[PDB]
């Protein structure tokens, strides 16, 4: 059977679920998904049922999505309710901290201020703010209301115990837990700020726009960011305390049945969704409100499959809630991300030589490493410019660049014999790329080549090639040299992967190689002893310049496609300051003063530079690069980038 066992937490939810079940059978062919209605006492019993393989799916709030993920349940998000409507599906809400312009403080200065909360136990209003501020709270931090009452000088915390902690109702005496209180609710908390009662209001990114219709009024307010700066209120996407998902269907991490759950719900919304006018309505019921799904929902979106819970909730939210539940308070060692066996051992004795200042975490892919940096499992790692872009869209920032001497050059290399080749028409020719998605091998070359054909389906412009990372059936995987599962894979077990592998690809079967400027010289004249390169001379190879001419290899300065942003270290903004510092020390202690090739960093790197003002993926790579990458993402297959862009379209 292709049955999805849906978990209800009430008799009304069960009744609607049974109706859901019956109407599906009139709509879905017998070879398709069906529904079964398991009923439990609570969302946690549902979570446990799903993990115990007694049910498959339930819809939860962000707090429960965290519970569902914790061991031993290990559930993940698979489908997302969206709101607003089809044009612009709203899946998340942002918890923000609104303040008045020129009030002169930031998040790390909230102690002593007057606070406005939507209500005790509420999320944007209480749980999130308090969870981020937890370790700033005075001890003892239990009971939490007492700690909060000894942190802000006075507050309006609706439904707080004003009798034992009157500070929490100074701005709304009695702490009224109803709209009878003027400072209650999302709109009430903002009023507490607007009226001058308080200095900050913990609400949602939308509260302000729903209570002030004119931009002139809104310009008198700002948001507190966690980097201890401020931004305007229409920039909440870059200045919030947490990005929270409104309503999320969860399922087993292994054992699914993600694919059926989506097929079921996708066809459910197509026949019974918003404004479908049937006897049965997926987003309402006469039996009660918000059964199975929120009544205000407009449809379902499929959660990208790379997404796990910690990634879907986000670093900030997870930090907040984790603090409230564990209650554990503390520059601490940098946890570096290693991608392979050889990289790991190099890291391991970097950790021993460091006397603790650097620990080592290992993952199997770069994107798995970035995911660990995002969610806290790891801290830093060095990345090609094409991966810092991905790391940027995912919320990370660059802390340091690799200097080898403005960075390295992206050159297109050709065999001198074949002298018909010019940059102006390589159409129908054999191409060699380091890997799809990287500066020299793809982003720059295919960036420029995107402008002159107006599309990124490059397996049709070129005849064939090796671009490790393309779908293994593509014409840009036919020249690759890996055997078995390694054919065309973007790692070492594909011989044509990397700067030099792409040049080897040119030597043995390609017509042009997109590569850095030091690659040909460093792999010719016997400098590389492996048979394929040992007897090569760099004079047999030329570079294609953009004007349309050709030029020898060692005068790349006048014959390059563009300047390439240097590789860079990336981390979370909440560790930018400490990763910079740890590393620079570890550099004049182990710098220019890898056992195989280029572990952790490229060994030709001489020092790690700081960027001053270019600590953003947009300001480090430059506008013309991100514009190019933006054009090539249309044809990109990066599952991690698909997850991060789901959170930030
Ligand atoms: C209805 C509802 C929602 C949908 C939603 O995002 N907005 C509707 C209600 C907003 C106000 C308020 C509440 O109803 O309790 N918020 C309290 C909270 O988050 O705990 C819900 C909210 O964040 O929107 C929600 O997101 O969370 C809820 C948690 C509850 N406990 C009870 C109800 C909700
Ligand atoms: C790492 C380092 C050390 C060892 C050490 O104790 N490091 C921590 C020093 C913290 C102050 C730090 C800073 O400005 O943040 N020093 C180094 C720097 O300027 O980068 C300042 C200084 O000692 O002049 C040191 O003793 O002298 C340095 C001088 C430098 N120039 C750069 C780095 C260092
Ligand atoms: Fe709420
Ligand atoms: Fe690179």
From Swiss-Prot:
Family matches, as Gene3D superfamilies: Periplasmic binding protein-like II (3.40.190.10)
Binding site for Fe(3+) 2: 384, 408, 499, 567
Location within or outside the cell: Secreted
SMART domains: TR_FER (SM00094)
Effect of residue 622 to E: In allele TF*B2
Domain of life: Eukaryota
Protein family according to the UniProt entry: Belongs to the transferrin family.
Organism expressing this protein natively: Homo sapiens
MF GO annotations: enzyme binding; ferric iron binding; ferrous iron binding; iron chaperone activity; transferrin receptor binding; transmembrane transporter binding
Protein name per the record: Serotransferrin
Disease linkage: Atransferrinemia: A rare autosomal recessive disorder characterized by abnormal synthesis of transferrin leading to iron overload and microcytic hypochromic anemia.
Domain notes: Has a bilobed structure, each lobe binds a single Fe(3+) ion. Does not always bind 2 Fe(3+) ions.
The gene coding this protein: TF
Sequence ranges assigned to domain Transferrin-like in this UniProt record: 4-326, 334-634
Described function: Transferrins are iron binding transport proteins which can bind two Fe(3+) ions in association with the binding of an anion, usually bicarbonate. It is responsible for the transport of iron from sites of absorption and heme degradation to those of storage and utilization. Serum transferrin may also have a further role in stimulating cell proliferation.
UniProt-annotated binding residues for hydrogencarbonate 1: 118, 122, 124-125
Glycan attachment sites: 30, 405, 454, 593
Effect of residue 552 to S: In allele TF*C2
PANTHER family assigned to the protein according to its UniProt record, in alphabetical order: SEROTRANSFERRIN, TRANSFERRIN
Disulfide bond annotation, renumbered to this chain: 7-46, 17-37, 116-192, 135-329, 156-172, 159-177, 169-175, 225-239, 331-578, 337-369, 347-360, 394-644, 432-505, 456-635, 466-480, 477-488, 545-559
Binding site for hydrogencarbonate 2: 434, 438, 440-441
Main location as per UniProt: secreted
Alphabetic keyword roster: Disease variant, Disulfide bond, Glycoprotein, Ion transport, Iron, Iron transport, Metal-binding, Methylation, Phosphoprotein, Repeat, Secreted, Signal, Transport
Residues recorded as bearing Dimethylated arginine in the entry: 21
GO BP: any one term: antibacterial humoral response
Residues annotated to bind Fe(3+) 1: 61, 93, 186, 247
One Pfam family named in its UniProt record: Transferrin
């Amino acid at each position: 059977d292709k049955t999805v066992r849906w978990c209800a937490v009430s008799e009304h939810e069960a009744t609607k679920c049974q109706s859901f079940r019956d109407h599906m059978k009139s709509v879905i062919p017998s070879d398709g998904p069906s529904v079964a209605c398991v009923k439990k006492a609570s969302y946690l019993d549902c979570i446990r049922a799903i993990a115990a393989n007694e049910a498959d799916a339930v819809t939860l709030d962000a707090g429960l999505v965290y519970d569902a993920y914790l061991a031993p349940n290990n559930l993940k998000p698979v489908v997302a309710e969206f709101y607003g409507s089809k044009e612009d599906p709203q899946t998340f809400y942002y918890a923000v901290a609104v303040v008045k312009k020129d009030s002169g403080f930031q998040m790390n200065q909230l102690r002593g201020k007057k606070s406005c909360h939507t209500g005790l136990g509420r999320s944007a209003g209480w749980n999130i703010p308090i969870g981020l501020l937890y370790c700033d709270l005075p001890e003892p931090r239990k009971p939490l209301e007492k700690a909060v009452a000894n942190f802000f000088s006075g507050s309006c915390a609706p439904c707080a115990d004003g009798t034992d902690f009157p500070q929490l109702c100074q701005l709304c005496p009695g702490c009224g837990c109803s709209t009878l209180n003027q400072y209650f609710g999302y709109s009430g908390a903002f009023k507490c700020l607007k009226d001058g009662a308080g200095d900050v209001a913990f609400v949602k990114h939308s509260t302000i726009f729903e209570n002030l219709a004119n931009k002139a009024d809104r310009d008198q307010y700002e948001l507190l960011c966690l980097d201890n700066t401020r931004k305007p209120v229409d920039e909440y996407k870059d200045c919030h305390l947490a990005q929270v998902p409104s309503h999320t269907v969860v399922a087993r991490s292994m054992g699914g049945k993600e694919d059926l759950i989506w097929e079921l719900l996708n066809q459910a919304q197509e026949h019974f969704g918003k404004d479908k006018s049937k006897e049965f309505q997926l987003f309402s019921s006469p039996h009660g409100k918000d059964l199975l799904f929120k009544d205000s929902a407009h449809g379902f979106l499929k959660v990208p499959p790379r997404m796990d819970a910690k990634m879907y909730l986000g670093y900030e939210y997870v930090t907040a809630i984790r603090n409230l539940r564990e209650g554990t308070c503390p520059c601490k060692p940098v946890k570096w991300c290693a991608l392979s066996h050889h990289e790991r051992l190099k890291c391991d004795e970097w950790s021993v030589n460091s006397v603790g200042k650097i620990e080592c975490v290992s993952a199997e892919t770069t994107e798995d490493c970035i995911a660990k940096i995002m969610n806290g499992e790891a801290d830093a790692m060095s990345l090609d410019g094409g991966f810092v872009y991905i790391a940027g869209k995912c919320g990370l920032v660059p802390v340091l660049a690799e200097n080898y001497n403005a960075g390295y050059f992206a050159i297109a290399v050709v065999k001198k014999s074949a002298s018909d080749l010019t940059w102006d028409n390589l159409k129908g020719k054999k191409s060699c790329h380091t890997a799809v998605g990287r500066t020299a091998g793809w982003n720059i070359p295919m960036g420029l080549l995107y402008n002159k054909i107006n599309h990124c389906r490059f397996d049709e412009f070129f005849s064939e090639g090796c671009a490790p990372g393309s779908k293994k059936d593509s014409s840009l995987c036919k020249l690759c040299m890996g055997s078995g599962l390694n054919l065309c894979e973007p790692n070492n077990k594909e011989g044509y992967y990397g700067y030099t592998g792409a040049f080897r690809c040119l030597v043995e079967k390609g017509d042009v190689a997109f590569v850095k400027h030091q690659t040909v010289p460093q792999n010719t004249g016997g400098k590389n002893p492996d048979p394929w390169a040992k007897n090569l001379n760099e004079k047999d190879y030329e570079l294609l310049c953009l004007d349309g001419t050709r030029k020898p290899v060692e005068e790349y300065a006048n014959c390059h496609l563009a300047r390439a942003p240097n590789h860079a270290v990336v981390t979370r903004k909440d560790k930018e300051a400490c990763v910079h510092k740890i590393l620079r020390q570890q550099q004049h202690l182990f710098g220019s003063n890898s056992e195989t090739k280029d572990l952790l960093f490229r060994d030709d790197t001489v020092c790690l530079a700081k960027l001053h003002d270019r600590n953003t993926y947009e300001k480090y790579l430059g506008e013309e690069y991100v514009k190019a990458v933006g054009n090539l993402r249309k044809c990109s297959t990066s599952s991690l980038l698909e997850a991060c862009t789901f959170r930030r379209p």
